[model samples]
Target chain A: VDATPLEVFLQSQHLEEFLPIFMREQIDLEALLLCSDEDLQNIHMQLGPRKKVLSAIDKRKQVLQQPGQLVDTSL
Target chain B: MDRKVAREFRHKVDFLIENDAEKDYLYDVLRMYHQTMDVAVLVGDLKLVINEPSRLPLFDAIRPLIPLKHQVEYDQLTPRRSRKLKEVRLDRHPEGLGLSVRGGLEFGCGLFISHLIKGGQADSVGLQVGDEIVRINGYSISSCTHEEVINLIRTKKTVSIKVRHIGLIPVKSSPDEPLTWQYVDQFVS
Candidate 1:
């Protein structure tokens, strides 16, 4: 299903409460992507199971760093 | 100020040109175009000399800024025409922006009051001279040269802008003495 648009989602429900948290997490993930691979492994060891969005961010960053390659989903 | 120093500054201008076009002082329109350049930086201390029967002051030279992010089409880096266009108000929904009556380069004197008069048209939109005009009608004016600012003003009637103002009233030229476009081009070296 199509994901709700960010602006629309913000207005419909009490999404402002969640926006800061989500945005903070996104920034953290972005920062982690800039770290070395070894650091990424150690960080991954500390992450919980519910970090689907963080994993998605990591996947996207890999696609960006190395374009046109099939990314490994196992990580 | 100093004759020797003035000449050196003139030499640095990127677009002020001379050619066998005509004997009219048609303000070089191309100097002000922003599509090709961004942030037309005209240093106020330098007064360009136009040697004719009476030596008049010509506008300063222009420079272009390069792109930050490499996109397929670097419209931000190309040489193009200027509108001398800029904005005053923050409200974009109802109204857009304003265009300079003359070139994009604002002179130091009475630049503030002129913007004050221009404010009535847009409900005191809150822009003044010395505020670096960076955009026209939402389009970046950074990629333009000095000639482009001249060219754009002659043709177009209106424009918009985004700007950088550090709170102080920046020095700018006044509309005090009526400067016609014809009177603008007599001296081209």
Candidate 2:
């Protein structure tokens, strides 16, 4: 319950190992939450780890950003 | 070393910091190893040969790998000479005080103030950074955990702090002329 959605997402990506990186870099969770695909590419140095984390983040974003649709009841 | 590799190494350290349990475990092992073998294992592909004469050079080499902020923190961790005792009154300040502390990794290292917040009560009391906190009130905190220290401080309204101010002591090098060792070994196969 204490964990943020991004923290959970990171753990799923195996990027959980590096959560301290944020503290060391002084990057807040909000900054990461606001990161775009382009931002991830620029910020993360290694392609392997970057790809892994970003894809997981991308998946989460899609789930969270799905457009709202009204149900059709007309027959 | 490639710049890219250095960047990669930085990332590895990021993970190392995140996993607190692993870091403490590694520190335990490394501290024992250093005590036994007189050597230090650096980040990657670097092994520091720790000897009295070579310690400074080895530390110098290790310095570059550490980030600038961490390097400053490392200096604070290094033991120095001087101590100051002061009674601090935070009761007058309604907002409380600000203090930054660095804990010891190995034994014999005591908790020290990394910095005191500017405009804070501790700052106004002339509590400088790098002052090693020896005791709080009348009790010694040499073996206290971070949580314990915090709790002790929190329990009191106005507490007396015993700190030793650390000043950089100069290491005198041998004034004799230095000679580079030249060796040639021949063996018949």
Candidate 3:
């Protein structure tokens, strides 16, 4: 599959912000979460729908609660 | 603290970075050529604090070393060509702890590959991707993070590598199975 379509879907929808914590240390979730309530007044803004991103983030939050598969490389 | 990495960095710098913290890191790297050693792998990890998007530019500069495959892939279509000569292919294994490497503080503010270029002598030895620097002569890098390790590499000049091969191998699984619903059920039952 052309990964670009998935990537474009993700970028236009801003799903990159929902990627796992290991990508970087901290993320500004509040700003992202606000997208859910913003008005999608135009057709181009359809991709801005935040339902999937928010749900994905919730699932990730539960996973990060304890180290199931995590191995700390802090050293 | 992989042995292969230590060997590479040690071979690269040969000696130790000078003791003064204020001196230029570039100078310490350059000094390696004047001293004596074979190869070494530099060790460090970078973490970005939540700030403006400016950090992405700096990361782009050292793109080869940042170590996240998805991030690299994400940037490919974008207009930004990472100025970094040393960008890493960072990927978080869906089922395991992901890995990355760096040269300075949480975010390295130094020139890419500058550590190796210095000391003109180190250029001859071959260094490559996926090498881990575990020791320098005998010092351990186990507890070091970005700042501490970078300072050590810059001043100590000569170090050793304890590397692990990041190249292809047979698809292998960790003996530790993932803890899933079935696993938990079996344990409880």
Candidate 4:
């Protein structure tokens, strides 16, 4: 019932259409964080949503790299 | 572009240090932190500046925003009274509503629409760039957080928005620069 970081990230990025796939496949935050294009392609997700997912994964990495964590710089 | 530390911050630093060297170190820490304008990192980095993590309140003097709501100095009272309100009703199943917002209560820029897609729902209706929302779906946004505004927008597709005509003037940081969170911080005192 709780929203994991991936769920929140998808919603905020307007990629919630892929939620059913994520939930049904049992993918969680830790798994999603490491995901890339091929990972999303394996799930047969669409183009834009896939790109956005890739972008999210990349952005998340950038944020994690920051020491104090950069402020919300908009998605 | 130059902002001196608030008088209160000096007082906090003064009380903490026993010698000039400590003052110099504290000053260095604050000076660098101020450049980044972060609060959490500030508290963690300065853990030695003041003992005890529970004592974080002592560093409140340099908090980026005590209450981010007050960031805009545009005669905060004028928006409600100006009577320049415009209402727009957005149809359901919309494609992202074709709008993107720049400012948020989080950054004290007051949530303003920064972009609108051409020939889209927002563009077809009474929406415009630089127009900040007053009430979305009948909820007053005066105190709404950035996440709250965005979440409210998604949960309910049939949307009604009441907006104030702030235009880009208040949102814009300068003649050419935009009113993003970073610039908005530079905008406010």
lDDT of 1 by residue, B59-129 (tens): 22222222333221333322122324445433323333342322222221111111333544433666553
> Candidate 1: lDDT over CA atoms?
0.32
Give each model's whole-structure lDDT: 0.32, 0.47, 0.30, 0.57
Clash number for model 4? 0
The candidate with the higher lDDT, 3 or 4, is: 4
Give the per-residue lDDT of model 4 (tens digit) for B96-187. 57777754543445667766677888888868765668777666665444555666566655778888765332343443453333212222
Task: Please give the interface root mean square deviation for model 1, in Å.
Answer: 23.6
Ranked by TM-score, the better of candidates 2 and 4 is: 4
Best by DockQ: 4
In candidate 2, which residue ranges exceed 4 Å CA deviation? A1-75, B1-80, B83-89, B104-108, B167-189
On a 0 to 100 scale, what is the lDDT of residue B135 in model 1? 48
Q: Residue B8's C-alpha lDDT in candidate 4?
A: 64
On residues B1-189, what C-alpha lDDT tens digit does candidate 2 reach at each position?
678755764455444345565445545544564455423233211221221221223344345546664555555543332233654445426646666664421122455565466888788777766566766655666534343455455555576677765421111123232311111111000
Provide the RMSD of all predictions against the true structure, rounded to 1 decimal: 20.3, 23.5, 21.0, 13.8
TM-score of chain B of 4: 0.45
Question: What local lDDT score does residue B184 receive in model 1, on the 0 to 100 scale?
Answer: 19
Question: Could you give candidate 4's per-residue lDDT for residues A1-75 as a string of tens digits?
Answer: 345555555655677688789888888767887677888889998787888678756655643443231123221
Given candidate 2, what's the lDDT at residue B72? 58
Ranking by TM-score: 4, 2, 1, 3
Of the candidates shown, which would achieve the greatest TM-score relative to the real structure? 4
How accurate locally is residue B28 in candidate 2, as Cα lDDT from 0 to 100? 59
